[PDB]
Design an enzyme around this catalytic site. Structure first.
Site, PDB file in Angstrom:
ATOM      1  N   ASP A 188      22.707  18.575 -35.481  1.00  0.00           N
ATOM      2  CA  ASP A 188      22.250  19.830 -34.854  1.00  0.00           C
ATOM      3  C   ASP A 188      21.931  20.865 -35.930  1.00  0.00           C
ATOM      4  O   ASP A 188      22.283  22.043 -35.823  1.00  0.00           O
ATOM      5  CB  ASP A 188      23.283  20.365 -33.853  1.00  0.00           C
ATOM      6  N   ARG A 192      20.167  28.548 -36.473  1.00  0.00           N
ATOM      7  CA  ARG A 192      21.284  29.070 -35.682  1.00  0.00           C
ATOM      8  C   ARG A 192      22.610  28.450 -36.093  1.00  0.00           C
ATOM      9  O   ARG A 192      23.670  28.978 -35.732  1.00  0.00           O
ATOM     10  CB  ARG A 192      21.054  28.820 -34.186  1.00  0.00           C
ATOM     11  N   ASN A 193      22.586  27.334 -36.823  1.00  0.00           N
ATOM     12  CA  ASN A 193      23.817  26.690 -37.259  1.00  0.00           C
ATOM     13  C   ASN A 193      24.010  26.813 -38.759  1.00  0.00           C
ATOM     14  O   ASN A 193      24.677  25.979 -39.371  1.00  0.00           O
ATOM     15  CB  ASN A 193      23.855  25.227 -36.834  1.00  0.00           C
ATOM     16  N   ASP A 206      28.664  24.475 -37.263  1.00  0.00           N
ATOM     17  CA  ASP A 206      28.198  24.324 -35.880  1.00  0.00           C
ATOM     18  C   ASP A 206      29.146  25.068 -34.960  1.00  0.00           C
ATOM     19  O   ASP A 206      30.304  24.661 -34.798  1.00  0.00           O
ATOM     20  CB  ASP A 206      28.087  22.865 -35.458  1.00  0.00           C
TER      21      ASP A 206
HETATM   22  F1  LIG Z   1      30.016  20.972 -42.861  1.00  0.00           F
HETATM   23  C1  LIG Z   1      29.284  21.208 -41.745  1.00  0.00           C
HETATM   24  F2  LIG Z   1      28.725  20.017 -41.413  1.00  0.00           F
HETATM   25  F3  LIG Z   1      28.255  21.998 -42.138  1.00  0.00           F
HETATM   26  C2  LIG Z   1      30.094  21.785 -40.628  1.00  0.00           C
HETATM   27  C3  LIG Z   1      31.153  22.646 -40.888  1.00  0.00           C
HETATM   28  C4  LIG Z   1      31.876  23.149 -39.811  1.00  0.00           C
HETATM   29  C5  LIG Z   1      31.531  22.790 -38.509  1.00  0.00           C
HETATM   30  C6  LIG Z   1      32.272  23.294 -37.305  1.00  0.00           C
HETATM   31  N1  LIG Z   1      33.174  24.369 -37.647  1.00  0.00           N
HETATM   32  C7  LIG Z   1      32.786  25.680 -37.409  1.00  0.00           C
HETATM   33  C8  LIG Z   1      33.774  26.652 -37.269  1.00  0.00           C
HETATM   34  C9  LIG Z   1      33.405  27.971 -37.031  1.00  0.00           C
HETATM   35  C10 LIG Z   1      32.060  28.314 -36.939  1.00  0.00           C
HETATM   36  C11 LIG Z   1      31.617  29.721 -36.679  1.00  0.00           C
HETATM   37  C12 LIG Z   1      31.879  30.526 -37.907  1.00  0.00           C
HETATM   38  C13 LIG Z   1      32.610  30.157 -39.022  1.00  0.00           C
HETATM   39  N2  LIG Z   1      32.603  31.193 -39.914  1.00  0.00           N
HETATM   40  C14 LIG Z   1      31.880  32.232 -39.407  1.00  0.00           C
HETATM   41  N3  LIG Z   1      31.674  33.405 -40.027  1.00  0.00           N
HETATM   42  C15 LIG Z   1      30.924  34.265 -39.302  1.00  0.00           C
HETATM   43  C16 LIG Z   1      30.399  34.009 -38.045  1.00  0.00           C
HETATM   44 CL1  LIG Z   1      29.458  35.182 -37.221  1.00  0.00          CL
HETATM   45  C17 LIG Z   1      30.640  32.780 -37.444  1.00  0.00           C
HETATM   46  C18 LIG Z   1      31.415  31.853 -38.154  1.00  0.00           C
HETATM   47  C19 LIG Z   1      31.143  27.286 -37.088  1.00  0.00           C
HETATM   48  N4  LIG Z   1      31.472  25.999 -37.318  1.00  0.00           N
HETATM   49  C20 LIG Z   1      30.459  21.926 -38.362  1.00  0.00           C
HETATM   50  N5  LIG Z   1      29.738  21.419 -39.379  1.00  0.00           N
END
Ligand SMILES: FC(F)(F)c1ccc(CNc2ccc(Cc3c[nH]c4ncc(Cl)cc34)cn2)cn1
Length: 327
Positions: A188, A192-193, A206
């Site tokens: 995804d 936005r991500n 995400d």
């Molecule tokens: F490594 C990757 F694949 F990129 C990855 C890392 C983490 C994730 C799922 N974990 C998360 C946890 C919180 C968030 C939202 C979030 C955090 N720090 C922030 N700082 C500011 C704001 Cl406004 C939103 C956030 C997103 N994903 C998915 N994929």
């Protein structure tokens, strides 16, 4: 009983299977390393950063997380009390995949977790500028051309220029290269991500269950899932095939958003049977206005119908690093 694809697009770790095939790892099987465990009491919650039907992310202060007698701002992902066990399992599985992946500059990193007692709390890095898509959109009118006086913009120091866009494209390719090296498929990837922090470092993430997916029209009801169709490779749309190469397709769509300063992909093309036909027949977006020719060239190769002809993230990183040197 929820069908989880209705609520988020889960990342996947793959493992070698028979012959040259890969198979998905069941993330509940991955270990959670208790070195991450962090006292729930040493957290102080502030504003909500995002929320969906069953999950939320909220800003918090963590006492002593990184230095013994210092506090730091973090983001905490957690579930609402109305969540079902299927969501509670999904959040632990997300924590297990984070514990497996390790640390990288261009992803939102795991800093700690609270897993005993009450709800699972997943503590990650806080990114003060928020999601890149909203950032590009509010910065859109103050984007400044190369040889133009700083006096024409009010906040010329906080404005957006081509050097920023090439930097963001380079950092996201580096984060995706890291993911692919751990056999991780995001599934995804989109502006936005992606989050933006101090120093304008981009971090892939995400929101997942902390996104109100039912009201984000970038997710389309397709089968019994909500899918980001305009970001997806044809093999994912039509055959549910997700590979390192389908992530590359999504990265090309991300690049188009980035250099369009947050425009929506495929304008004048609602997702319907006509959209799917045109994608099969080879319709591809044209170059965004602010995209240099070589970045648009990467985009086109990201969208090759033949997945073997798409670049890898490792090659994309090499390409963009050279474009940055040459300017
Ligand atoms: F490594 C990757 F694949 F990129 C990855 C890392 C983490 C994730 C799922 N974990 C998360 C946890 C919180 C968030 C939202 C979030 C955090 N720090 C922030 N700082 C500011 C704001 Cl406004 C939103 C956030 C997103 N994903 C998915 N994929």
């Amino acid at each position: 009983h929820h069908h989880m694809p209705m609520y988020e697009v889960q990342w996947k770790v793959v493992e070698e299977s028979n012959g040259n095939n890969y198979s998905y790892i069941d993330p509940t099987q991955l270990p959670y390393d208790h070195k991450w465990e962090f006292p729930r009491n040493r957290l102080s919650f502030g504003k909500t950063l995002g929320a969906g039907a069953f999950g939320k992310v909220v800003e918090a202060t963590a006492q002593g997380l990184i230095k013994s007698d210092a506090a730091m701002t973090v983001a905490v992902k957690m579930l609402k009390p109305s969540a079902h066990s299927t969501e509670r399992e999904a959040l632990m599985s997300e924590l297990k995949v984070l514990s497996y992946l390790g640390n990288h500059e261009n992803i939102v990193n795991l800093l700690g977790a609270c897993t005993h007692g009450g709800p699972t709390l997943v503590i990650t890095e806080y990114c003060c500028y928020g999601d890149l898509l909203n950032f590009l959109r509010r910065k859109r009118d103050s984007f400044h051309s190369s040889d133009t006086s700083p006096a024409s913009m009010e906040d010329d120091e906080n404005a957006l220029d081509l050097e920023d866009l090439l930097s963001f494209s380079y950092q996201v390719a580096k984060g995706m290269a890291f993911l692919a090296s751990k056999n991780c498929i995001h599934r995804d990837l989109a502006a936005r991500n992606i989050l933006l922090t101090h120093g304008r470092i981009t971090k892939i993430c995400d929101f997942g269950l902390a996104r109100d997916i039912k009201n984000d029209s970038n997710y389309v009801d397709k089968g019994n899932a909500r899918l980001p169709v305009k970001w997806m490779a044809p093999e994912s749309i039509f055959n549910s095939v997700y590979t390192f190469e389908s992530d590359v397709w999504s990265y090309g769509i991300f690049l188009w958003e980035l250099f369009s300063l947050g425009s929506s992909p495929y304008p004048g093309m609602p997702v319907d049977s006509k959209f799917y036909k045109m994608i099969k027949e080879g319709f591809r977006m044209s170059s965004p206005e602010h995209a240099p020719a070589e970045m648009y060239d990467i985009m086109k190769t990201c969208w090759d119908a033949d997945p073997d002809k798409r670049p890898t993230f490792k090659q994309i990183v090499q390409d963009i690093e050279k474009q940055i040197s040459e300017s």
